[PDB]
C-alpha cells in the first residue's frame, strides 16, 4: 500500500545559527507568498475564504501569531533537520495603490528576489527529497487522524510519485527556495 515513513531526525538539533536562518527564511517565505496571493488579488479577511479571495494571514510578518508564524518556520525546520539526518553538512560559509489596497496594513512586501538564482541539479534532486519528506510527514500525521478516529480515507493519502505536480507544488516551491535562500546567505551544503 503506502506507508509514509518520514525520515529518522534522531540526535538531530539545531544550533543557534541554523535557528537564526530558519527564521530570517520564514520572514523571507511569508513575504514571498504574501507579494503572491496580492498579485492574484487576494486581500486580507479576519476569517479564510477560499471563495473570496480573503486571508487572514495577510498582515506583515510582525503582525502574525506564533500559530502562523510556525506555519512557515515548522516545515522548513522539519527539511533542515532531515538534510543533517541523513548526512549532509550545512556550512555557514513606486507603490501600487491597488497592491496597497490588498490589506488595511501598508503593507507592501518586498522580499529578495531569489528567481534570479540557479539551483544546481542535484539541489533540484535534494529539494524533491525534502518534499516528497514534508508529503510523508503529513501522510503519517494525517493517517494517524484518520485511524484515531475510526477510519477513513483521504485522495492525497498516496506515495509522493503518484501525486500530481499541483499536488507537490506547495512543498516543492518551498524546498527549492529555501535551498536557494541558504545559498543567497552563504550556506554551502555538502553531500555525504
Ligand atoms: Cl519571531
Ligand atoms: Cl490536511
Ligand atoms: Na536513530
Ligand atoms: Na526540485
Known amino acids: 500500500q503506502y506507508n509514509p515513513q518520514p525520515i529518522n531526525t534522531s540526535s538531530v538539533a539545531l544550533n543557534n545559527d541554523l535557528n537564526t536562518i530558519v527564521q530570517k527564511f520564514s520572514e523571507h517565505y511569508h513575504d514571498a507568498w504574501a507579494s503572491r496571493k496580492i498579485e492574484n488579488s487576494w486581500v486580507y479577511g479576519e476569517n479564510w475564504s477560499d471563495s473570496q479571495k480573503a486571508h487572514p494571514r495577510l498582515k506583515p510578518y510582525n503582525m502574525l ?10 516545515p522548513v525546520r522539519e527539511s533542515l533537520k532531515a538534510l543533517l539526518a541523513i548526512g549532509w553538512s550545512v556550512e555557514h560559509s513606486p507603490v501600487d495603490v491597488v497592491t496597497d489596497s490588498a490589506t488595511p496594513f501598508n503593507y507592501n512586501p518586498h522580499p529578495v ?65 529555501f535551498l536557494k535562500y541558504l545559498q543567497y546567505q552563504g550556506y554551502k551544503l555538502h553531500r555525504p
Open 65 to 74: 501569531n506564533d500559530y502562523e508564524k510556525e506555519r512557515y518556520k515548522e
Open 113 to 177: 528576489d531569489m528567481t534570479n538564482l540557479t539551483l544546481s541539479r542535484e539541489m533540484q534532486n535534494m529539494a524533491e527529497r525534502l518534499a516528497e519528506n514534508a508529503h510523508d510527514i503529513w501522510a503519517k500525521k494525517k493517517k494517524e487522524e484518520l485511524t484515531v478516529n475510526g477510519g477513513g480515507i483521504h485522495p492525497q493519502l498516496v506515495p509522493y510519485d503518484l501525486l500530481t505536480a499541483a499536488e507537490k507544488a506547495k512543498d516543492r516551491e518551498r524546498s527549492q527556495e
